[PDB]
Design a protein around this ligand. Structure first.
Ligand SMILES: [Mg+2]
Ligand SMILES: [Mg+2]
Ligand SMILES: [Mg+2]
Ligand SMILES: [Mg+2]
Ligand SMILES: [Mg+2]
Ligand SMILES: [Mg+2]
Ligand SMILES: [Mg+2]
Ligand SMILES: [Mg+2]
Ligand SMILES: [Mg+2]
Ligand SMILES: [Mg+2]
Ligand SMILES: [Mg+2]
Ligand SMILES: [Mg+2]
Ligand SMILES: [Mg+2]
Ligand SMILES: [Mg+2]
Ligand SMILES: [Mg+2]
Ligand SMILES: [Mg+2]
Ligand SMILES: [Mg+2]
Ligand SMILES: [Mg+2]
Ligand SMILES: [Mg+2]
Ligand SMILES: [Mg+2]
Ligand SMILES: [Mg+2]
Ligand SMILES: [Mg+2]
Ligand SMILES: [Mg+2]
Ligand SMILES: [Mg+2]
Ligand SMILES: [Mg+2]
Ligand SMILES: [Mg+2]
Ligand SMILES: [Mg+2]
Ligand SMILES: [Mg+2]
Ligand SMILES: [Mg+2]
Ligand SMILES: [Mg+2]
Ligand SMILES: [Mg+2]
Ligand SMILES: [Mg+2]
Ligand SMILES: [Mg+2]
Ligand SMILES: [Mg+2]
Ligand SMILES: [Mg+2]
Ligand SMILES: [Mg+2]
Ligand SMILES: [Mg+2]
Ligand SMILES: [Mg+2]
Ligand SMILES: [Mg+2]
Ligand SMILES: [Mg+2]
Ligand SMILES: [Mg+2]
Ligand SMILES: [Mg+2]
Ligand SMILES: [Mg+2]
Ligand SMILES: [Mg+2]
Ligand SMILES: [Mg+2]
Ligand SMILES: [Mg+2]
Ligand SMILES: [Mg+2]
Lengths: 100, 54, 146, 122, 113, 155
RNA sequence: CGCGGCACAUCCACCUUGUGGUGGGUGUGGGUAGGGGAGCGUCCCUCAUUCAGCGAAGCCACCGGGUGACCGGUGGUGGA
RNA sequence: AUGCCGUGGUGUAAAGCGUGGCAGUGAGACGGCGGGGGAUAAGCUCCGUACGUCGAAAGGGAAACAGCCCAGAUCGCCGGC
RNA sequence: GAAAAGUACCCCGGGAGGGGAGUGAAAGAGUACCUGAAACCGUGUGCCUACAAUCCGUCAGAGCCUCCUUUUCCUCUCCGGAGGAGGGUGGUGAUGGCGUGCCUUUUGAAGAAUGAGCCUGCGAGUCAGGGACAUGUCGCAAGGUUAACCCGUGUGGGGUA
């Protein structure tokens, strides 16, 4: 069985025991989180309905906080003398799916 | 006529590697018991003793 | 990450299309899609998915009379004044399979992968093909209603 | 005081040359050429990070269309019917489903077809 | 891996490209075959290269005490040495430069059945 | 470029050569040429008003006194013969810190010479006190006559 | 529009309630000439402190870090 | 008809006015509308236009295509309209 | 190099040069000598490349090679891991899309307008003045301040013109 869990403005197809990198959640390491779903497939059933899905949530455990890859930006235009360097490192949260 | 721009390393090397020496095939000959290797075109001279093996 | 086909993932099948009355453009589009593999959900533009396509009865394809009389096929040999033109009518008289093959090849992406894709195309003028050892299942043009 | 430039000046050279490893020609050997290539490389990376969202959506749409037409329906009406049925499954997950669980994709097709109106041209 | 001996010829007055032209003929061959290949090679750089190979074989046999009949030219190359600069006068007062290039020739021979 | 040796004449012709025009062989872009905006002899000294100078010195000595780092002694050596050993012992008894300022009268030669070469000891006359020396010193040691002279001078 | 990070301005309340920090709203953040603000790196002097023939500088490689100029750790070479 | 001056209301943070410091600019281009010169030709030339874009503006569309149509890039996302 | 302790002797070689010995803390100091960067030139090796039209990159991406780990297998297991799978480093990049080099000067340049073969080093808003204007900050305040000069080892004290 598996489901489509919605979090951080995105959706992920997960099963029990999966590990997902999602957007940062204001939750510390170790405790549990419950997330809404958009679809649940349990073999031949899909349940495809807002009312039935709104009473089902997946439970995950925060495994920790990590960072995305370092991104280097150097904006440049042809004959202007214009340059602009900039870096970025997105903050992420690692979830271990235990619910559904 | 002068070159318009300098060649790239690959373009220079492809031509430069075609400047090479051809190897001469050698046969075996014995003179006074000692065995040497000479180019075949000098086999007669080697047999007659006109070749200085150094 | 989204699925990316690996080596050995792709599977090929054999299709035979009878062109006895199909319009040339319709037949060409169907054959091109079949060759490229756009009918499979595992499609990836950088992978040569798709199936072998056999076209038979290539001489029977449907072309208008004015097209037979007026549509030109051009070639340049590279020499000055080296432009040679033949009508689609003469081309169908001489090599009917070439008309179909040219139409199909004009519809594939213009890159290297199309060169390897088009190797799976076989066009014959008659109603017989030598690939009975393979088992080409017949394919008919269908339009999904909207 | 007189200051020699070398110690300060070599830091950016080392960074640029390290970043330009794997380029071919002067672009991986000379600092001046590696600098221009670095400008182009980072502009290309910035542009492509934005464009790849569209590219991936395009790929998902193509695969979803393939699966829908396999189940005898157009992408048009499949999307319209899913919206009508109120299914908010993503396009990415729809394509993943199409490849992984064809039975589930078929079930979704029946749901969308049922949710579609009786005559779509009125 | 194999027992080996080294010989070097530094500051040899032959251009490195010209030395490479003949080194490529004997790279990888046994000492006996390389010596006579260089003996019958018409190029002038065949002399110094033959001398270095013979010296390396002599080093192996004398210092290392290895059997000469099993020696193989394993590694051989020619680096650039220092270059001296001269002047060649030309038409209408122009003066062009001339380079006297030299080479460093390195040979490694190892003994193997 | 006007002071480097030579460089008077124009090295060659402006036109028809294929090279940059140069004007002189001592132009700054040349090796061995002149220096542009290079150092010249300079006078570094400012016009700090006397009121500020005196206020700063008074504040430094006030800090020293408030923290209790001011000592007064009658003299450094009993006799007229200098003795670095006895002087060092006396200062070690008085204080234990590395830097010491000693303010003694300009006429006390035996006391001057006794501590002249001790590391971490600085000597100056009562009328030459200043902020830098006082702030560098960990402690300030006054002779009685020097302290009275300074106090009388400042009323 | 959704979710997350940054910054500027303004507003609302706290902390020294404008030198400035704490939290929350709202707006704003393409940019040449040009104007304003704040920083990185090299060298020398002074004060304090600390490392160094059990190995300084310089150089080379690898593994990491910061919003930028850039930085750190480890190893090798080297010898003040 | 518009446009312009004044006035009373309503709305709108980054409007306006005075006085100082520091500027750059003073060769513009194309497009829409109104005109002059020209042959009512010019990718021609000269004016007007709280008209636009480029200049100094990336992104999507027009096959390609400074100046046309849509739209103004703080950064990240393998989300949606 | 601290000090010539500047390589006795043997071997290849006409020599040059080298190898072994030897000196030296070090020859990763050998009179071409402290450290020893880059351009540039070789040798070995992993991957790719001879049906393809490439501002040379970037995003997507198979396949190989290498080094580490989680499983089940050789259980010889103290081994170690061959090998099987998975996962991750690093190298390479078949294949798909996008993509007109930098500077200057211009209304406008990828431009067929200028300049640049490459690397290393050097090369351009500075100093003087009780100058002028405006500001930030500090001392004193209806007053503020000294110039020359004098006395001091000094950066300190005097000095009202
Ligand atoms: Mg411009
Ligand atoms: Mg000729
Ligand atoms: Mg590469
Ligand atoms: Mg978008
Ligand atoms: Mg003459
Ligand atoms: Mg002069
Ligand atoms: Mg002159
Ligand atoms: Mg000189
Ligand atoms: Mg000089
Ligand atoms: Mg004075
Ligand atoms: Mg914006
Ligand atoms: Mg801005
Ligand atoms: Mg500017
Ligand atoms: Mg030592
Ligand atoms: Mg230094
Ligand atoms: Mg070091
Ligand atoms: Mg009017
Ligand atoms: Mg103003
Ligand atoms: Mg004018
Ligand atoms: Mg004008
Ligand atoms: Mg008009
Ligand atoms: Mg007109
Ligand atoms: Mg015009
Ligand atoms: Mg106009
Ligand atoms: Mg301009
Ligand atoms: Mg644009
Ligand atoms: Mg604008
Ligand atoms: Mg556009
Ligand atoms: Mg839509
Ligand atoms: Mg020794
Ligand atoms: Mg050493
Ligand atoms: Mg040394
Ligand atoms: Mg040298
Ligand atoms: Mg050296
Ligand atoms: Mg091939
Ligand atoms: Mg093309
Ligand atoms: Mg590509
Ligand atoms: Mg293109
Ligand atoms: Mg012009
Ligand atoms: Mg050009
Ligand atoms: Mg050109
Ligand atoms: Mg031009
Ligand atoms: Mg010009
Ligand atoms: Mg010209
Ligand atoms: Mg030129
Ligand atoms: Mg100054
Ligand atoms: Mg003031």
């Amino acid at each position: 069985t598996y489901a489509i869990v919605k979090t951080g403005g995105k959706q992920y197809k997960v099963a029990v025991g999966d590990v997902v990198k999602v957007e940062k959640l204001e939750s510390e390491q170790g405790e549990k989180v419950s997330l809404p779903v958009a679809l649940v497939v349990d073999g031949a059933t899909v349940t495809t309905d807002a009312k039935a899905l709104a009473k089902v949530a997946v439970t995950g455990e925060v495994l920790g906080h990590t960072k995305g890859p370092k991104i280097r930006i150097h904006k440049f235009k042809n004959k202007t003398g214009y340059h602009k360097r900039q870096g970025h490192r997105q903050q992420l949260t690692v979830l271990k799916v235990t619910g559904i | 006529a002068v070159p318009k721009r300098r060649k790239s390393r690959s373009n220079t090397r492809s031509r430069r590697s075609q400047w090479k020496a051809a190897k001469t095939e050698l046969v075996g000959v014995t003179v006074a018991g000692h065995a040497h290797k000479v180019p075949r075109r000098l086999l007669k001279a080697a047999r007659l003793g006109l070749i200085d093996f150094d | 990450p989204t699925y990316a086909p690996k080596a050995g993932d792709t599977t090929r099948s054999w299709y035979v299309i009878d062109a006895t009355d199909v319009v040339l453009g319709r037949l060409a589009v169907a054959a091109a899609n079949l060759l490229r593999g756009k009918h499979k959900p595992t499609f990836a533009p950088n992978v040569d998915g798709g199936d072998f396509v056999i076209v038979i009865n290539a001489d029977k394809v449907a072309i208008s009379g004015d097209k037979l009389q007026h549509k030109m096929v051009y070639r340049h040999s590279g020499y000055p004044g080296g432009l040679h033109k033949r009508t689609i009518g003469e081309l169908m008289q001489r090599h009917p399979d070439r008309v179909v093959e040219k139409a199909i090849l004009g519809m594939l992406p213009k890159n290297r992968l199309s060169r390897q894709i088009q190797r799976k195309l076989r066009v014959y003028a008659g109603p017989e093909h030598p690939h009975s050892a393979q088992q080409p299942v017949p394919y008919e043009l269908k339009q999904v209603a909207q | 005081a007189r200051v020699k430039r070398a110690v300060n000046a070599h830091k950016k050279r080392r960074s640029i040359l390290k970043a330009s490893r794997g380029y071919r020609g002067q672009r991986s050997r000379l600092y001046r050429k590696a600098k221009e290539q670095q400008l182009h490389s980072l502009n290309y990376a910035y542009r492509d990070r934005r464009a790849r969202k569209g590219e991936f959506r395009k790929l998902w749409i193509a695969r979803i269309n393939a699966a829908a037409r396999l189940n005898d329906i157009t992408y048009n009406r499949l999307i319209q019917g899913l919206k009508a049925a109120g299914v908010e499954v993503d396009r990415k997950n729809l394509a993943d489903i199409a490849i992984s669980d064809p039975a589930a994709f078929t079930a979704l097709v029946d749901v969308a077809r049922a949710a579609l109106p009786e005559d779509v041209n009125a | 891996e194999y027992p080996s001996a080294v010989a070097k010829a530094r500051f040899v007055r032959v251009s490195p490209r010209k030395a490479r032209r003949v080194i490529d003929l004997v790279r990888g061959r046994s000492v006996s075959d390389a010596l006579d290949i260089l003996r019958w090679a018409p190029q002038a750089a065949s002399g110094p290269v033959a001398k270095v190979i013979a010296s390396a074989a002599a080093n192996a046999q004398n210092n290392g005490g290895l059997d000469p009949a099993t020696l193989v030219v394993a590694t051989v190359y020619a680096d650039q040495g220092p270059t001296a600069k001269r002047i060649r006068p030309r038409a209408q007062g122009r003066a062009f430069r001339i380079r006297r290039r030299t080479s460093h020739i390195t040979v490694v021979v190892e003994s193997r059945p | 470029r006007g002071e480097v040796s030579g460089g008077g004449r124009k090295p060659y012709r402006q036109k028809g050569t294929g090279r940059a025009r140069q004007g002189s062989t001592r132009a700054p872009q040349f090796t061995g040429g002149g220096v542009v905006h290079g150092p010249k002899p300079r006078d570094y000294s400012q016009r700090t008003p006397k009121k500020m100078i005196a206020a700063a010195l008074r504040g430094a000595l006030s800090d020293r006194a408030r923290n209790g780092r001011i000592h007064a002694i009658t003299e450094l050596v009993e006799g007229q013969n200098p003795s670095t050993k006895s002087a060092r012992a006396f200062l070690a008894s008085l204080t234990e810190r590395k830097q010491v300022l000693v303010v003694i009268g300009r006429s006390d030669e035996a006391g001057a010479k006794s501590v002249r070469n001790l590391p971490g000891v600085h000597i100056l006359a009562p009328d030459q006190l200043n902020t830098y020396d006082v702030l560098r010193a960990d402690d300030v040691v006054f002779s009685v006559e020097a302290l009275n002279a300074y106090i009388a001078a400042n009323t």
